[PDB]
Amino acid sequence: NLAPLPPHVPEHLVFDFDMYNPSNLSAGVQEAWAVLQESNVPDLVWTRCNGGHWIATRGQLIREAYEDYRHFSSECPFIPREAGEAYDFIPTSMDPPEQRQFRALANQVVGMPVVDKLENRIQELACSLIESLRPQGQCNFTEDYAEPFPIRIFMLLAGLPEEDIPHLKYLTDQMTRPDGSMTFAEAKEALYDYLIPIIEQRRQKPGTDAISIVANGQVNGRPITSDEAKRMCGLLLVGGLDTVVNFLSFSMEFLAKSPEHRQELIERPERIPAACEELLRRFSLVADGRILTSDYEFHGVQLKKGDQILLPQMLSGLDERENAAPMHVDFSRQKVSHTTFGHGSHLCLGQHLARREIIVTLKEWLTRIPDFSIAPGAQIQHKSGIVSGVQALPLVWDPATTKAV
Numbered sequence: 038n039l040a041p042l043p044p045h046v047p048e049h050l051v052f053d054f055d056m057y058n059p060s061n062l063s064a065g066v067q068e069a070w071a072v073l074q075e076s077n078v079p080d081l082v083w084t085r086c087n088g089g090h091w092i093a094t095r096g097q098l099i100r101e102a103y104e105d106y107r108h109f110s111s112e113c114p115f116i117p118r119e120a121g122e123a124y125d126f127i128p129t130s131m132d133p134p135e136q137r138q139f140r141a142l143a144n145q146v147v148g149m150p151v152v153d154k155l156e157n158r159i160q161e162l163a164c165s166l167i168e169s170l171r172p173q174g175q176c177n178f179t180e181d182y183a184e185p186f187p188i189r190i191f192m193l194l195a196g197l198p199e200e201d202i203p204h205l206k207y208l209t210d211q212m213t214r215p216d217g218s219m220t221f222a223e224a225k226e227a228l229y230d231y232l233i234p235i236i237e238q239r240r241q242k243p244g245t246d247a248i249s250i251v252a253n254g255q256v257n258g259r260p261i262t263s264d265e266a267k268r269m270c271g272l273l274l275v276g277g278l279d280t281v282v283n284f285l286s287f288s289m290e291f292l293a294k295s296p297e298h299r300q301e302l303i304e305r306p307e308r309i310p311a312a313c314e315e316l317l318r319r320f321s322l323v324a325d326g327r328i329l330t331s332d333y334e335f336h337g338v339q340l341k342k343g344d345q346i347l348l349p350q351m352l353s354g355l356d357e358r359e360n361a362a363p364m365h366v367d368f369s370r371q372k373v374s375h376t377t378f379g380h381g382s383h384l385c386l387g388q389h390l391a392r393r394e395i396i397v398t399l400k401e402w403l404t405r406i407p408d409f410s411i412a413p414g415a416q417i418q419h420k421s422g423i424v425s426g427v428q429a430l431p432l433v434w435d436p437a438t439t440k441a442v
């Protein structure tokens with residue numbers, strides 16, 4: 038239902054969009070959000086859904102907002118407000134200048150140098166998974182590849198038992214697309230309860246895994262506390278278990294429905310990296326936000342202290358004012374404009390690991406299973422939230438057309 042419209046919010050700016058169940062979801066999640074960019078929708082609207090909040094609908098405002106951390110603080114980054122207030126992950130819940138000392142350490146565990154160190158293993162897993170699937174001539178992509186491929190890689194980096202994935206993934210999903218069985222606060226606490234004993238164990242017997250590095254690391258010269266390590270490790274876990282998983286599904290669904298695009302990569306493998314970026318734009322999937330630190334007039338709209346504003350990273354690249362024919366996938370698009378990995382001081386620290394996982398996937402899959410389609414009659418269903426995803430993606434193919442490496 039709709040929260041009563043606050044006195045300061047203009048009546049004509051109301052557009053009741055529900056980020057957890059957009060009305061046009063059946064056409065595809067990106068399409069559902071794109072309705073916010075239809076001809077008569079303002080640059081900044083107010084939805085009375087989920088407690089009521091602002092929504093920047095165009096890249097120009099989304100980028101500005103993300104750059105102005107003074108006015109748009111990440112202290113309360115999630116909608117609804119309850120989730121946003123319980124949200125205390127490091128470094129994501131902090132703004133510069135305090136954010137930096139913590140972001141630096143986090144960059145040390147998932148940055149480019151670590152990704153290069155994971156190249157071999159990422160490659161090996163990708164190939165083992167696809168080869169095992171190749172002869173079967175079918176698969177449930179979300180559970181057969183999208184989830185295990187990137188999640189196992191992350192669990193390897195964090196030195197955590199794979200058998201722990203079911204629980205952690207369940208908790209992460211409740212924070213991004215809650216089924217209603219758990220509030221953000223409850224899911225966060227379970228995530229923290231899980232980490233506490235591990236963090237203590239690794240601060241005693243330091244390992245080389247991401248968790249040991251964080252728990253035994255320093256923050257601009259001084260030792261990090263147990264609580265800080267917990268708040269950071271929990272964030273790393275959430276970031277490594279949802280985004281790449283669902284992005285791969287969006288990309289492969291598209292590829293399964295587009296033979297011509299598959300051929301382009303088949304005949305022109307050098308384009309895979311470029312295709313990666315275009316897909317990252319077209320199937321952008323996250324949308325979190327900021328909270329107003331003080332009353333502030335933004336693009337002619339009076340925003341009040343405390344007001345929450347959703348700044349959909351997903352919307353920038355879909356904005357027709359940033360890319361012509363935005364909904365069209367063009368692997369040759371001259372200037373791929375987007376904010377898929379965020380924008381500002383919080384730019385995705387795992388974007389390098391993500392790009393690597395995406396390119397290796399496209400490369401290794403197309404090489405062994407160049408021809409595949411979506412299971413006949415299958416009605417693909419998307420789900421919306423802080424991170425949007427694909428519920429299921431049944432693929433099929435003729436093993437005869439496949440190739441073993």
Ligand code: HEM
Pocket residue numbers: 111114127128129130140143147272273274276277280281284322323325326350376377378379380382383384385386387388390391
């Ligand atoms: C396609 C995949 C990915 C997408 C689209 C994505 C997107 C995002 C976005 C939009 C933000 C910033 C949100 C904000 O400003 O509040 C972000 C931050 C972050 N991401 Fe990702 N991400 C991806 C993969 C990864 C991976 C693999 C990791 C690894 C753990 C990761 C780690 C992080 C971290 C640590 C931050 C917080 C940075 C900070 O707060 O300064 N991300 N990501």
Ligand SMILES: CC1(C)[C@@H]2CC[C@@]1(C)C(=O)C2
Pocket residue numbers: 126129213272275276280323324325423424
């Ligand atoms: C918006 C995000 C993708 C980013 C990493 C996990 C996530 C859900 C956060 O809370 C910060």
Ligand SMILES: [K+]
Pocket residue numbers: 042043044045046047048
């Ligand atoms: K009003």
Ligand SMILES: [K+]
Pocket residue numbers: 112113121122123124125130
């Ligand atoms: K908070």
